[PDB]
Amino acid sequence: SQTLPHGHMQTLIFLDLEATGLPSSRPEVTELCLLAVHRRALENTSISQGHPPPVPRPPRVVDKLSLCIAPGKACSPGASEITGLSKAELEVQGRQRFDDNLAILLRAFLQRQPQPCCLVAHNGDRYDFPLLQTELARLSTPSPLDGTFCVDSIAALKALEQASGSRKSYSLGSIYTRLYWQAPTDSHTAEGDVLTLLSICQWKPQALLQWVDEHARPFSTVKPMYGT
Amino acid sequence: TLPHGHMQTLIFLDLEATGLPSSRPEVTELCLLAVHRRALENTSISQGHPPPVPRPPRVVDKLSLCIAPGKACSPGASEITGLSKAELEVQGRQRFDDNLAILLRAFLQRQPQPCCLVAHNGDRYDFPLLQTELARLSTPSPLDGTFCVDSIAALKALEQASRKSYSLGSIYTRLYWQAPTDSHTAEGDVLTLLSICQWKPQALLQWVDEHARPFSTVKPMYGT
Numbered sequence: 001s002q003t004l005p006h007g008h009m010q011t012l013i014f015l016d017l018e019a020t021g022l023p024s025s026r027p028e029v030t031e032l033c034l035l036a037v038h039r040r041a042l043e044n045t046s047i048s049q050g051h052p053p054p055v056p057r058p059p060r061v062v063d064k065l066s067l068c069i070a071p072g073k074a075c076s077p078g079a080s081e082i083t084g085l086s087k088a089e090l091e092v093q094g095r096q097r098f099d100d101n102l103a104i105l106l107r108a109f110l111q112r113q114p115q116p117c118c119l120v121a122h123n124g125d126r127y128d129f130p131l132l133q134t135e136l137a138r139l140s141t142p143s144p145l146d147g148t149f150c151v152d153s154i155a156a157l158k159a160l161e162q163a164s165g166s167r168k169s170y171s172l173g174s175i176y177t178r179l180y181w182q183a184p185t186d187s188h189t190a191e192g193d194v195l196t197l198l199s200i201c202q203w204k205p206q207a208l209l210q211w212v213d214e215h216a217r218p219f220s221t222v223k224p225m226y227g228t
Numbered sequence: 229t230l231p232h233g234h235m236q237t238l239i240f241l242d243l244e245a246t247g248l249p250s251s252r253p254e255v256t257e258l259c260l261l262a263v264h265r266r267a268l269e270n271t272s273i274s275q276g277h278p279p280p281v282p283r284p285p286r287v288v289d290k291l292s293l294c295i296a297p298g299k300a301c302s303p304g305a306s307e308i309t310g311l312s313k314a315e316l317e318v319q320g321r322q323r324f325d326d327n328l329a330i331l332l333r334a335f336l337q338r339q340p341q342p343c344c345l346v347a348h349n350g351d352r353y354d355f356p357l358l359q360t361e362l363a364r365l366s367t368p369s370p371l372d373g374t375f376c377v378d379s380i381a382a383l384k385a386l387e388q389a390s391r392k393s394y395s396l397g398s399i400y401t402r403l404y405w406q407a408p409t410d411s412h413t414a415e416g417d418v419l420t421l422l423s424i425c426q427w428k429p430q431a432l433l434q435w436v437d438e439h440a441r442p443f444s445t446v447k448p449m450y451g452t
């Protein structure tokens with residue numbers, strides 16, 4: 001008689017973004033990647049066996065969107081160094097700002113995915129989700145995420161590693177190296193970090209899906225990082 | 229004097245589908261990788277033997293989608309692409325439909341113009357098939373102001389001097405003297421194509437500028 005809050009998630013959308021700086025700087029998004037995987041494709045992953053297990057093979061059927069976005073303010077020195085992006089370079093390559101057409105693009109990508117759909121992002125609750133909420137709030141469209149759910153993979157992997165704890169880092173790279181005994185690739189790029197996150201979430205797919213189903217919350221409840 | 233000016237965006241494109249042209253095939257996967265002209269011009273020039281495989285530019289836009297066809301894949305198609313109608317359906321993929329055109333239009337709108345599609349064998353397969361799929365929709369085609377070229381012709385010109393296979397894999401191994409290691413997916417084929425096109429990036433861009441033609445002139449593979 002105990003039931004899930006929002007049903008079984010049929011799509012997980014792994015999400016990462018890069019931005020101009022840390023939250024108190026009121027940052028703007030400079031890169032976004034979404035990787036949509038159906039529940040069945042995740043639970044089709046070969047069981048992890050051995051120590052270390054091989055890095056899981058990404059499912060054959062996936063949908064991917066990766067975009068670079070011109071910010072309205074400069075990247076901090078540290079942000080440009082870590083991410084490899086700068087306002088100057090995004091402008092010389094004619095990247096457009098975060099605008100209504102981008103919301104329309106995002107909505108049409110999300111609409112191709114079976115519902116219910118859940119965003120999954122590492123530190124999403126403190127960074128990616130509030131910042132995306134802020135960017136979308138500036139636009140004239142409805143939120144393209146208004147019927148989409150979300151979860152933070154830090155909590156998920158803390159739970160999953162407990163089932164298999166203190167001053168163990170739950171950074172993306174730390175987890176990946178603990179699970180697979182190799183370093184990740186293309187760190188601090190939106191698509192590279194989404195692919196690393198997919199690999200971590202393919203470690204124990206059934207357990208990950210159960211945790212996500214139980215912890216998914218509506219994206220519409222995410223408080224913006226900062227306001228107009 | 230170029231026919232349509234300097235191309236500001238190259239969009240590397242690959243389509244996978246249910247079969248060969250006489251079967252009246254339907255698209256099962258599409259990948260677009262949009263690269264600004266300056267990002268290609270910034271590719272390092274090795275001038276060594278062998279040249280290292282270029283790495284992709286930092287700034288790229290990418291779209292990869294799986295699409296449910298209305299007809300089954302041939303056995304050959306499923307073997308080569310790793311896709312099937314049944315599996316695409318069980319994973320809830322949608323057809324090539326109006327919402328997909330909204331998505332393609334919005335993605336294209338984020339690229340500086342003029343924009344040129346680049347596809348390996350695109351003149352005989354990918355471009356006519358895409359034309360057919362878009363023609364079935366109510367929406368006017370999002371590609372009617374876009375240009376296109378076939379990268380088989382490009383690499384024939386870039387390798388000519390002033391027997392060779394022009395399969396994607398053969399070209400990559402001939403240029404880089406190592407085997408490709410991208411996945412057998414639409415995105416894998418696009419990444420291999422990008423690497424080939426980064427072998428001589430200024431020369432590739434010059435050939436594309438000289439040979440770009442309007443996508444509106446591509447004849448559909450087949451008609452309703």
Ligand SMILES: O=c1ccn([C@@H]2O[C@H](COP(=O)(O)O)[C@@H](O)[C@H]2O)c(=O)[nH]1
Pocket residue numbers: 016017018019020021022076078079082083188189193
């Ligand atoms: O030392 C740091 C670490 C992270 N960030 C910001 O954190 C964003 C997202 O973090 P990540 O996805 O690269 O881990 C980055 O785009 C960047 O703007 C910094 O500015 N300085």
